[model samples]
Target: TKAVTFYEDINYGGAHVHLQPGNYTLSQLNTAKIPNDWMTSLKVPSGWTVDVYENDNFTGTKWTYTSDTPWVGNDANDKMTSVKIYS
Candidate 1:
């Protein structure tokens, strides 16, 4: 499996993108077809960590996930603009 998987809807449903361990900027995320503020849930590989940012270049608020997340909470829902995945 990929290091992390981002879902467009809550409860891990709808469109999704798989990412390996690395840092992703807003442009890169766009290229990957992950629309801004569209990530609502995600799957994190065991022992790996995923950081979701609210703004470009990893700025603004951030949320960290180290395990499967069915939902990213109301505040964090659909707020992913950039990301960092660590193995």
Candidate 2:
């Protein structure tokens, strides 16, 4: 599978458009190695939503604040499973 990186908002939920639905993994970058905002702020295109997972289990929807403490190293060094999206 090809990897796509998003850095801005885009239009979605429209007609006459092709929607590619697939899963993606969201991994946290090492705070010391990457930008500080990498974990605190993430930008998802308008038509897409992010589903978080832990240990291959469903967690929650987009913008959902995880019960786990932020930057506590739970999701800090963890990788979330893939989620489907429509365009």
Candidate 3:
């Protein structure tokens, strides 16, 4: 299996960002600069869900899962999958 790593947005206010084969972490700017409840009212694209995980457990958050690509599959099919997000 191949592994990929992502860099945190230093311009925003994140520390190190790293991802291994089984786990990962994603850091977003603590937009608390606006309001404490800002994230509560935030909207997600259709077919996706938003969840918050404590600490820096990206895999635990399921932030990338969508209706079309849930986190389970059969290995024999060679149907490996990963996530990609856009702004």
RMSD of 2: 11.5
Off by over 4 Å in 1: none
Candidate 2 residue lDDT tens string, 1-87: 222132111221111112233443433222113222233323344544444334222444333322322232334222333333433
Instruction: Please report how far candidate 3 places residue 47 from its true position, in Å.
Output: 0.6
Q: Estimate each model's TM-score.
A: 0.95, 0.30, 0.24
Ranking by TM-score: 1, 2, 3
Full-model lDDT, candidate 2: 0.31
What is candidate 1's lDDT per residue for 1-87, written digit by digit as tens? 565889998899999989999899988998999999899999998899998899989889999999999999898998888998999
Q: lDDT ranking from best to worst?
A: 1, 2, 3
The number of clashing residue pairs in model 2 is 0
lDDT of 3 by residue, 1-87 (tens): 222322222222323222223422332322212211112112234444433332344332233322322222222111112223332
All models: lDDT? 0.91, 0.31, 0.27
Model 2 segments more than 4 A misplaced: 1-20, 25-41, 57-77
Model 3: residues with Cα > 4 Å off, grouped in runs: 1-38, 59-87
